[PDB]
Amino acid sequence: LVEQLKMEANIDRIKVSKAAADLMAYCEAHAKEDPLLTPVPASENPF
Amino acid sequence: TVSAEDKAAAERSKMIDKNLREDGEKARRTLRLLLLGADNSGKSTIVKGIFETKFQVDKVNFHMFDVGRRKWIQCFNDVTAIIFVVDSSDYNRLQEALNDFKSIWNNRWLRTISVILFLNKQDLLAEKVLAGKSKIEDYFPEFARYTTPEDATPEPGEDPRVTRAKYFIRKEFVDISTASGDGRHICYPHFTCAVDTENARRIFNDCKDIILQMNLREYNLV
Amino acid sequence: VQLVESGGGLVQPGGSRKLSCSASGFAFSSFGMHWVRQAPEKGLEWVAYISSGSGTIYYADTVKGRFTISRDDPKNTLFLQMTSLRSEDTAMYYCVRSIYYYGSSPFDFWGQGTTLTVSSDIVMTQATSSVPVTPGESVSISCRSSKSLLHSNGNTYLYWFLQRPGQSPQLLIYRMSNLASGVPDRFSGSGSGTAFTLTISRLEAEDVGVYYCMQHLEYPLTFGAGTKLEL
Amino acid sequence: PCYNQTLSFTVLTCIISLVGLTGNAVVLWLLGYRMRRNAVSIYILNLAAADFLFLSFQIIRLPLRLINISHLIRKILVSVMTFPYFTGLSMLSAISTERCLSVLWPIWYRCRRPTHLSAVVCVLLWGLSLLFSMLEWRFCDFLFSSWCETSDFIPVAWLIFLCVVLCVSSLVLLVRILCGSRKMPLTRLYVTILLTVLVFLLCGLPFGILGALIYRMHLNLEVLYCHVYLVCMSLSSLNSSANPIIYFFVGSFRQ
Amino acid sequence: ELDQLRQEAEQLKNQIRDARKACADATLSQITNNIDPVGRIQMRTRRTLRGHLAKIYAMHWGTDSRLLVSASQDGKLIIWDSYTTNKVHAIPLRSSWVMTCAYAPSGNYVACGGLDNICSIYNLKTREGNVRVSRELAGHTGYLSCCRFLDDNQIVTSSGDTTCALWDIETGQQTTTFTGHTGDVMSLSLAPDTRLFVSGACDASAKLWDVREGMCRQTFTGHESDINAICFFPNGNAFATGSDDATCRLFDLRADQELMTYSHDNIICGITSVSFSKSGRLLLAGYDDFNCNVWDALKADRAGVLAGHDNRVSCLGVTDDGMAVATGSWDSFLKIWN
Ligand SMILES: C[C@H](CCC(=O)O)[C@H]1CC[C@H]2[C@@H]3CC[C@@H]4C[C@H](OP(=O)(O)O)CC[C@]4(C)[C@H]3C[C@H](O)[C@]12C
């Protein structure tokens, strides 16, 4: 806390809008390659 | 159909099922107890990571676990009973023991686990009371309003004052026990002299009563 | 990790002989065991299989009723009893361990052989029986199954063994893709249904020998004819 | 219908059978998949199945007593229906004695039980209820010799044995409960034990004793027995209807 | 002296809070309000893994997404083949009190730990056809709440001693010690790149630790209760924490503040386990209400309920391809959901 609090005091903090935008971009980019979002046909479902 | 290797894998899984069933059958006939105490209470002297002791009485096995809390007490959910050991010789830490018992009794995950209470000091309590150096009423001002009930089970070699103090402490634990229990579990208060050898029998009888209560509860009798 | 077998000898035709396989260094109780015979001139031929826990028993269609395979897990040993020996049975017998679970590699270890002297199944055929090779080159061998070894679960049950003459055969690649534990990375198996191949790159010493491809799709466990490699 | 006063009896028995099927179906569905089957839940399960069969044959049999009288297939129907009846009484006795044994020896019941005795007793009692169906069936019984032609009181012996063992198990449980430490939950344990005893005796049992006495003395229902048989049938139907209630829904709604 | 240090710490905390507030201009809810919702997600249970005789406390999927390890209170570590429900392995443990599972990324090893304060690494793929304990890592003064495999030789384990430890398995000794938590650390989540990890503790704070440096880089304090579970976002620049206050929270590594709260008025049960979908759009959250929940990670809207357990859901996992989600509960049953 003597120096760690000051070490973490100055972080390269980008705006919350930028973080939200990149999170949403990642979510939309990979939304077409996972099965829990859109169910896959039973032919390609191992379970 | 499944292939030959898949059939052999299924056979291996069936053998594993049989081994697990056998292990569970052997482990079902043991009773798991959770030993708890604050300090200098003689928890390890009750019966003559985790310290685990197995003792067998009346052809039944008991497992006693002590850990040397709100997080790891969650694991002991299927334990048959919590054995809480209290040092009654002193009174400065007696209220700390009362708060500890209240916290354990009112724990969310221990809402169906009964407690066997071992007030571990009997002779030391007698010496402390008879000496008169320490005023028990000073720590607990409820002595003026507390009187020994008409129905008493004193031993042959006892003094009325020592019996009154012992019953006061037992009552001071059982009011906490009975305040919020909803009937799902019951505290079993006892008194040991730290030299008494009939302590595993007491745990055995209390656990038999606990198991009887569970049988009555989940078989529609209670 | 040791399978030492005893038995064998001069037996008159129609006689009976029991031969044993003592297993040490591994959990014999959890391994399904095989007896596999090979003729003095011909290749490998699976004989019998005793499962783990003795729950499942299989024999070849040529020795059914006259051979009895059993195991003694507490004694960690395997038994093969024979009845009515014939001259077409005299061979060299191998005791093979094989454990079956997901990702397992059955036919891991083959014990040293016992020499016995008496005096519907799918076909795995190796087109080439002997090829000339030189160290440091690249060679490829192939064999064909009677029917596709691909299964509905995506596993193609093809196993490659290298005899290395003068010693018992050892597993090289299993399920036609996977590599056995301890074999060099130069070996590589591939192929599709009814057509599989094994490629050896930069052959070194202790590589020449007879290569057998066998199937584990159905329990008759047909072996290949073998493919000898020579300098 | 000997002369009259049958439509109301049929309607009441049909309503009781309908609610019995409803209760047995819901309890069977709940216990088949949404249950753990610890030690006695299997007993409630097969008892509910037996009751479902019992009121199933009850609904199959009773309403045709008014139309297209044949007096022949009804004997077959009651003979078939008496098998789920004995099955249900047998599992009632099994439940009673299992509770008595759990109270008497809790350590053995929890620790030393084989964890499969319930299914063994299940199949044994079902197979035994397949037996003792030859009470009235003195028809080509001798296919060879030492058999009771008319006075075959073995089914009655089995029924009375089930009754006495159930009663003695309940009595022993009550004595053990009253002769120990008193936490005093003796307000609903009394009512549930007495209710089980009554629904076993005041209902259900009258049908069995009527059947035993009717096959003991060959009575053709005459002109005065056209009302007591209907009463016994309705009592048995009510017992089979209320059995799933008292044995599972009381516990389900208790918490 | 002490007063000056306390005043300096308070001023630094106020400055950090002001910096976080200045970097907040629009919440993710406002940004994603103009986005089509996930709708209703109906996962059905395809496989049920029976064979555990006690409450299941942890599980971990394999990297091949077919084998899964599980630990229960009966002192058995069981490796299942999820496709066939076949039991690939089942081995006993020295201590029956085990509350964490780890599956090596290669699959050659598994890990376990609990009230014995020892992390046991078991070798699966070996000779002699049986798995044996390959290593016993000791040095934690408290119970082990989570353990994760950095690789086949490194392992990060968080304990109740209010610490985490990076061990080299070959040496068996602690390579790095991460300290700074004031309460029992209950969970840890390795980053996808495996260079830093987040650890949640009983002090209602989630701390991001750099594995290479060995020092805490960021601290997040949004919860008001012990953080039971933590899960890194698939991107690696965010994570989700689940605590006893019946709320989940989304934090960012670059924004240094909470993003969304996943809570409902009808939910009062604490969180026991959290997980993300493959794309990170759905946050799977195991609860104490005997059932799991699916949250829209971008809109904080419930998508569905995974209610198949008769007791609380203790462990959760999602396969690397996201095909299935495995939930293990205290009713000794593991269920795979698709
Ligand atoms: C439960 C007992 C078995 C006794 C025992 O196991 O110890 C069963 C067996 C045969 C059953 C009788 C058959 C015909 C009897 C005469 C009438 O005939 P129907 O209307 O046509 O049925 C009415 C039914 C009837 C009064 C049945 C009464 C009773 O239910 C019996 C006796």
Side-chain angles (χ1 to χ4, degrees), chain A residues 1-2 4-5 9 11 13-31 33-39 41-43 45-47, chain B residues 1-24 26-38 40-47 49-50 53 55 57 60-69 71-77 79-88 90-91 93-95 97-107 109-110 112-127 129-132 134 136 139-141 143-144 146-149 152 154 156-158 160-170 172-176 178-181 183 185-194 197 199-222, chain C residues 1-40 43-74 76-83 85-87 89 91-117 119-127 129 131-132 134-136 138-201 203 205 207-227 229 231, chain D residues 1-4 6-10 13-14 16 18-34 37-51 53-132 134 136-137 139-141 143-152 154-181 185-216 218-226 228-232 234-251, chain E residues 9 12 15-16 19-20 22-35 37-39 41-43 45-93 96-167 169 172-194 196-211 214 216-218 220-242 244-262 264 266-300 302-328 330-338:
Chain A
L1 175 143
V2 196
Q4 203 258 302
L5 191 58
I11 304 315
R13 261 173 218 111
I14 56 102
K15 314 291 286 254
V16 172
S17 309
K18 184 176 181 179
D22 66 59
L23 225 79
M24 184 194 31
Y26 182 96
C27 264
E28 308 314 313
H30 299 245
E33 75 201 29
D34 77 340
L36 291 203
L37 255 295
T38 56
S43 72
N45 190 359
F47 307 94
Chain B
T1 176
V2 311
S3 44
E5 310 222 62
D6 229 311
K7 289 188 224 127
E11 204 184 339
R12 162 187 185 85
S13 161
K14 291 191 299 234
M15 277 201 43
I16 291 190
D17 285 330
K18 300 205 203 95
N19 197 312
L20 296 175
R21 278 196 280 272
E22 142 176 74
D23 277 359
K26 316 198 280 253
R28 196 197 39 132
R29 64 211 43 242
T30 204
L31 293 192
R32 273 158 322 130
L33 305 154
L34 171 57
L35 190 44
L36 283 171
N40 66 66
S41 52
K43 322 147 43 156
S44 54
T45 326
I46 280 299
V47 202
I50 291 205
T53 91
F55 58 99
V57 317
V60 84
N61 295 297
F62 292 105
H63 257 285
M64 188 98 98
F65 307 98
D66 79 58
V67 191
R69 162 178 83 205
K71 302 310 288 194
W72 61 257
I73 210 85
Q74 165 177 248
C75 307
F76 296 84
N77 209 71
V79 133
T80 205
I82 284 161
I83 294 171
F84 204 93
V85 186
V86 182
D87 190 317
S88 293
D90 81 346
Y91 316 112
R93 318 202 32 198
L94 201 295
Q95 250 288 350
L98 284 158
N99 295 343
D100 194 2
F101 178 70
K102 196 180 301 141
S103 97
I104 279 295
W105 186 261
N106 290 107
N107 211 293
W109 303 116
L110 320 171
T112 52
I113 281 79
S114 314
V115 183
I116 304 162
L117 194 69
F118 279 121
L119 299 143
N120 181 355
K121 264 61 195 189
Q122 179 74 193
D123 50 348
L124 256 66
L125 216 167
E127 328 215 341
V129 174
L130 290 193
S134 89
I136 180 155
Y139 312 92
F140 295 82
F143 268 95
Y146 170 76
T147 75
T148 318
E158 58 91 17
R161 165 86 247 159
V162 175
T163 279
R164 155 179 192 77
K166 292 178 10 156
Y167 280 22
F168 169 73
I169 295 180
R170 199 139 61 74
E172 211 61 80
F173 276 89
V174 304
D175 38 356
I176 293 176
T178 54
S180 79
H185 57 310
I186 164 175
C187 169
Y188 298 91
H190 292 308
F191 267 108
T192 80
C193 77
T197 176
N199 245 332
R201 185 53 69 156
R202 271 208 226 81
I203 298 168
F204 173 74
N205 293 330
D206 274 341
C207 285
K208 158 159 35 148
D209 180 31
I210 283 160
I211 294 197
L212 166 60
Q213 293 297 297
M214 308 177 348
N215 285 351
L216 293 173
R217 229 137 43 199
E218 80 190 22
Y219 295 8
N220 204 16
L221 288 320
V222 173
Chain C
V1 298
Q2 210 210 6
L3 290 150
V4 164
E5 307 142 40
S6 315
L10 262 296
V11 196
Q12 61 108 29
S16 301
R17 158 97 38 171
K18 148 159 271 163
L19 56 73
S20 277
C21 159
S22 325
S24 72
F26 70 97
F28 173 86
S29 78
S30 35
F31 277 85
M33 315 281 310
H34 299 255
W35 277 107
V36 170
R37 81 160 146 235
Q38 96 153 332
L44 300 170
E45 156 157 20
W46 170 81
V47 162
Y49 160 74
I50 174 58
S51 159
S52 177
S54 310
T56 294
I57 273 280
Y58 290 124
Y59 297 100
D61 45 286
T62 88
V63 297
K64 54 155 166 325
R66 27 185 300 249
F67 281 17
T68 303
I69 182 173
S70 68
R71 80 192 304 165
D72 207 10
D73 307 309
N76 266 2
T77 179
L78 210 74
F79 312 118
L80 192 72
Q81 252 285 333
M82 305 154 200
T83 278
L85 293 195
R86 39 174 87 142
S87 199
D89 159 8
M92 161 99 105
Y93 286 76
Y94 295 113
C95 184
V96 188
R97 98 200 192 145
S98 88
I99 185 183
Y100 303 93
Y101 53 89
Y102 182 76
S104 56
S105 76
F107 295 76
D108 321 63
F109 192 60
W110 294 49
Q112 318 104 26
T114 70
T115 318
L116 192 82
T117 87
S119 89
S120 176
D121 316 339
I122 89 177
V123 189
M124 306 271 331
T125 154
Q126 307 194 38
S129 306
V131 301
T134 56
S138 170
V139 304
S140 149
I141 52 196
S142 304
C143 66
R144 327 178 269 86
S145 173
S146 142
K147 81 171 191 176
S148 185
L149 287 183
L150 212 54
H151 202 88
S152 79
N153 52 47
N155 266 299
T156 155
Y157 303 102
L158 183 103
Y159 296 66
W160 277 93
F161 305 91
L162 159 77
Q163 168 98 16
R164 228 169 281 161
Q167 90 180 39
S168 143
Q170 64 173 242
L171 182 74
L172 285 196
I173 68 111
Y174 57 98
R175 242 76 48 87
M176 161 226 86
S177 288
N178 312 102
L179 224 79
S181 150
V183 305
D185 211 359
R186 339 185 307 261
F187 297 103
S188 29
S190 69
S192 73
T194 74
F196 314 91
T197 161
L198 178 82
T199 309
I200 316 151
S201 293
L203 315 80
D207 195 325
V208 306
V210 202
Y211 292 83
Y212 305 93
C213 67
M214 71 144 252
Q215 60 97 21
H216 219 307
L217 190 59
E218 322 218 290
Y219 250 105
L221 296 204
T222 325
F223 282 73
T227 313
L229 260 66
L231 261 297
Chain D
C2 88
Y3 217 44
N4 273 317
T6 326
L7 178 50
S8 269
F9 253 113
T10 54
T13 278
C14 278
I16 293 176
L18 263 286
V19 56
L21 271 311
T22 310
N24 289 292
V26 50
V27 68
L28 214 40
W29 155 60
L30 192 183
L31 261 151
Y33 333 107
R34 284 91 184 165
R37 326 264 191 62
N38 37 12
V40 85
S41 262
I42 293 130
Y43 279 116
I44 289 119
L45 171 94
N46 45 355
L47 159 75
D51 286 306
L53 269 89
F54 182 82
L55 304 321
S56 147
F57 309 110
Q58 264 283 325
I59 304 193
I60 262 54
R61 192 169 65 85
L62 177 276
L64 71 95
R65 186 185 226 241
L66 196 67
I67 176 66
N68 278 49
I69 327 300
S70 34
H71 269 137
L72 250 72
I73 38 63
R74 173 137 47 260
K75 313 263 202 60
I76 303 332
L77 286 144
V78 278
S79 181
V80 174
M81 183 185 38
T82 208
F83 152 63
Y85 178 119
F86 272 73
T87 297
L89 264 47
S90 186
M91 253 75 63
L92 281 187
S93 166
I95 282 169
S96 172
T97 183
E98 286 292 2
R99 295 195 284 92
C100 162
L101 289 176
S102 74
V103 169
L104 281 191
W105 295 294
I107 308 288
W108 167 84
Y109 207 85
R110 276 256 170 275
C111 308
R112 256 89 47 62
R113 267 252 300 193
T115 71
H116 57 62
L117 195 68
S118 165
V120 170
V121 180
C122 204
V123 302
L124 187 154
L125 295 184
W126 276 95
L128 270 275
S129 177
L130 298 169
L131 277 81
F132 322 81
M134 329 327 159
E136 181 66 272
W137 284 132
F139 277 16
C140 80
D141 257 7
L143 287 144
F144 323 115
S145 175
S146 182
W147 89 289
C148 306
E149 283 78 25
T150 300
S151 36
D152 198 290
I154 313 298
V156 192
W158 175 247
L159 162 74
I160 210 63
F161 158 72
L162 283 181
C163 171
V164 50
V165 72
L166 176 139
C167 293
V168 76
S169 301
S170 281
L171 164 75
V172 167
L173 178 142
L174 254 205
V175 166
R176 179 49 119 181
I177 271 289
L178 279 275
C179 289
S181 87
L186 269 80
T187 81
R188 109 193 200 190
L189 166 138
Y190 272 14
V191 82
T192 188
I193 297 268
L194 268 309
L195 209 64
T196 53
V197 169
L198 290 180
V199 303
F200 187 88
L201 301 185
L202 261 69
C203 291
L205 208 77
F207 191 67
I209 67 183
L210 165 156
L213 293 206
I214 275 180
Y215 98 84
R216 271 280 86 76
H218 307 299
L219 216 59
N220 277 319
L221 310 115
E222 74 143 0
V223 81
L224 312 180
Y225 254 56
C226 48
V228 69
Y229 173 62
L230 274 181
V231 169
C232 273
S234 204
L235 283 183
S236 37
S237 180
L238 186 130
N239 164 41
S240 274
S241 194
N243 226 16
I245 295 171
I246 179 174
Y247 276 99
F248 206 63
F249 298 143
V250 157
Chain E
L12 255 50
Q15 171 261 358
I16 282 185
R20 290 174 147 143
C23 286
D25 46 310
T27 87
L28 203 146
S29 187
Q30 321 173 333
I31 286 173
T32 325
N33 230 345
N34 291 336
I35 279 273
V38 86
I41 303 279
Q42 324 254 9
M43 295 149 200
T45 171
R46 316 278 162 143
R47 307 268 190 282
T48 303
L49 312 179
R50 320 163 205 272
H52 271 306
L53 304 140
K55 315 165 325 207
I56 301 167
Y57 230 81
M59 56 87 48
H60 202 201
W61 278 103
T63 36
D64 66 326
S65 328
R66 204 184 151 149
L67 297 190
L68 74 143
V69 78
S70 303
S72 49
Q73 294 279 126
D74 57 35
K76 282 260 181 181
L77 198 77
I78 292 192
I79 288 96
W80 313 78
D81 177 34
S82 32
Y83 289 10
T84 57
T85 53
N86 281 342
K87 233 178 304 282
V88 176
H89 283 115
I91 50 69
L93 319 159
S96 151
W97 315 104
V98 281
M99 65 210 282
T100 166
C101 270
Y103 218 150
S106 57
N108 309 338
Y109 291 108
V110 281
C112 215
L115 289 174
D116 32 287
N117 314 336
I118 291 163
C119 198
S120 300
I121 318 277
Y122 296 89
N123 194 353
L124 298 186
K125 313 185 188 167
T126 165
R127 274 163 119 191
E128 50 254 5
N130 56 1
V131 354
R132 50 177 182 41
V133 74
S134 96
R135 185 85 33 204
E136 290 260 85
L137 313 152
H140 274 303
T141 89
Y143 64 92
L144 285 126
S145 31
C146 201
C147 54
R148 280 299 168 269
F149 267 102
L150 249 69
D151 71 83
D152 253 28
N153 178 82
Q154 256 162 342
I155 179 138
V156 154
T157 74
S158 74
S159 100
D161 155 47
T162 81
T163 200
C164 305
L166 168 79
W167 319 66
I169 305 181
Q173 251 76 74
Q174 282 188 9
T175 302
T176 320
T177 293
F178 310 106
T179 50
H181 273 305
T182 36
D184 310 5
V185 193
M186 288 319 285
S187 190
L188 72 100
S189 208
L190 256 49
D193 54 81
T194 279
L196 25 73
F197 69 102
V198 283
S199 84
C202 271
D203 57 348
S205 70
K207 287 170 118 20
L208 172 93
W209 316 85
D210 186 273
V211 193
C216 178
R217 284 177 164 320
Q218 291 155 33
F220 310 90
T221 39
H223 280 286
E224 322 146 285
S225 266
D226 317 342
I227 288 178
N228 296 316
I230 206 156
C231 187
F232 244 109
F233 198 78
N235 178 8
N237 299 123
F239 58 95
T241 71
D244 285 344
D245 52 348
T247 74
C248 268
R249 251 153 185 113
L250 204 71
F251 297 97
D252 292 1
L253 305 201
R254 315 138 74 172
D256 252 37
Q257 45 210 291
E258 170 201 309
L259 231 48
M260 224 158 298
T261 321
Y262 311 96
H264 217 183
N266 35 294
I267 280 146
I268 35 176
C269 34
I271 286 267
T272 54
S273 73
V274 295
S275 258
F276 266 106
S277 194
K278 191 196 192 21
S279 57
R281 177 77 199 257
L282 307 161
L283 171 66
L284 273 300
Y287 278 94
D288 280 328
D289 222 331
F290 301 3
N291 72 325
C292 157
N293 255 265
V294 199
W295 294 89
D296 199 357
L298 303 176
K299 322 182 63 62
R302 296 171 69 187
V305 282
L306 273 39
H309 294 287
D310 302 311
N311 209 333
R312 67 166 249 190
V313 177
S314 87
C315 36
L316 212 83
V318 186
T319 73
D320 283 352
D321 34 313
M323 206 87 30
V325 48
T327 83
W330 275 10
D331 63 341
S332 73
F333 294 146
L334 287 130
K335 316 200 143 210
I336 279 93
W337 311 75
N338 253 259

